[PDB]
Amino acid sequence: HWGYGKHNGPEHWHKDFPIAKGERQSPVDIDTHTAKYDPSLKPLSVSYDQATSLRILNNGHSFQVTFDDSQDKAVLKGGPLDGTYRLLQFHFHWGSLDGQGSEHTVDKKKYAAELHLVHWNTKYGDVGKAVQQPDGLAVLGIFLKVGSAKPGLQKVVDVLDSIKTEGKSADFTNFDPRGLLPESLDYWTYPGSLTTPPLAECVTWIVLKEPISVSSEQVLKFRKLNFNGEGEPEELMVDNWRPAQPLKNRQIKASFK
């Protein structure tokens, strides 16, 4: 039932998911001058060389690329994290125009899109158990700005016509998510939530400072996706982002000065 429209969007979600008004909701605005440099924060360890992508899917809210998470093949460690987090999937949030689309904001600036690489803590054994824990998930967030093309995104772009409408999926093997990463792993981190229902308060957020650039042609292909199922009235999948939520009693920490 939930979505991004006037009658089912973010301002409505609290009715089905009352944690929407909780103490550690995401996304947030990252006020760069208030974030605390923490010299105790470790470099982030991103180990994606053995990643196994499986499928690409239009789930009615975004599209996602899903990975084999039955072994420690594509893992996030270090940074603010204790233990090992397996990559489950990545997906994006984006706008109808280039001035909106990101979930996190930086000094109130909105980026054209935001990439989320979703990982879960292997100490809980499966993702469903992990979402019930305050340290169950780690989501790596990467901003997208529009300029030059990102070559490592093109394989994704080119198959989106095959998953236009909700419920559609395709094979998507041998995709290397290292081609989506910026040069720097400098980051901000804070305790938060899933940004879609069920909005569980289970996420250590790690938001990279450096955006990636994608081309206008690449993001325009995102905007040709449909929220609707095949044959239903066509509603472009655009503006699938939750706005910034109150920071409440939280500190955003920076890995860099």
Ligand X SMILES: [N]S(=O)(=O)[C][C][C][C][C]C1234B567B89%10B%11%12%13B85%14B%1158B%12%11%15B%139%12B%1061B%12%112C5%153B%14874
Within a 10 A sphere around the Cβ of 65, how many other Cβ atoms? 23
Please report whether residue 181 would count as binding ligand X according to CB under 6 A: no
| CB closer to Zn ion out of 140 and 157 | 140
Residues 207-246 that bind ligand X (CB under 6 A): none
The pairs formed by 245-248 with CB atoms below 8 angstroms and a separation of 24 or more are 245/25, 245/26, 245/27, 245/28, 246/25, 246/28, 247/28, 247/29, 248/23, 248/24
Residue pair 135/205 in contact (Cβ under 8 Å)? The answer is no
Residue 20: phi, psi to the nearest 5?
Answer: -55, -25
Residues 90-149 that bind ligand X (CB under 6 A): 116, 118, 127-128, 131, 139
CB of 131 to ligand X, least distance (A): 5
CB of 124 to ligand X, least distance (A): 12
Q: Please select the residue that binds Zn ion; options are 24, 86, 110, 116, rule is CB under 5 A.
A: 116
Considering only the stretches 32-40, 48-56, 116-124, 127-135, report the one whose residues sit in contact with Zn ion under the rule CB under 5 A: 116-124
Checking DSSP bridges between strand 203-208 and strand 137-146, what pairing results, if any? parallel
Please report whether residue 86 would count as binding Zn ion according to CB under 5 A: no
Question: Could you check whether the bond before residue 27 is cis, i.e. omega within 30 degrees of 0?
Answer: yes
Token digits for 176?
């290397």
Interaction partner, residue 194 (ligand X, Zn ion, none; CB < 5-8 Å by kind): ligand X
Q: Is 1 a catalytic residue?
A: no
Binding site for ligand X (CB under 6 A): 116, 118, 127-128, 131, 139, 194-196
Active site residues: 61
Binding site for Zn ion (CB under 5 A): 116
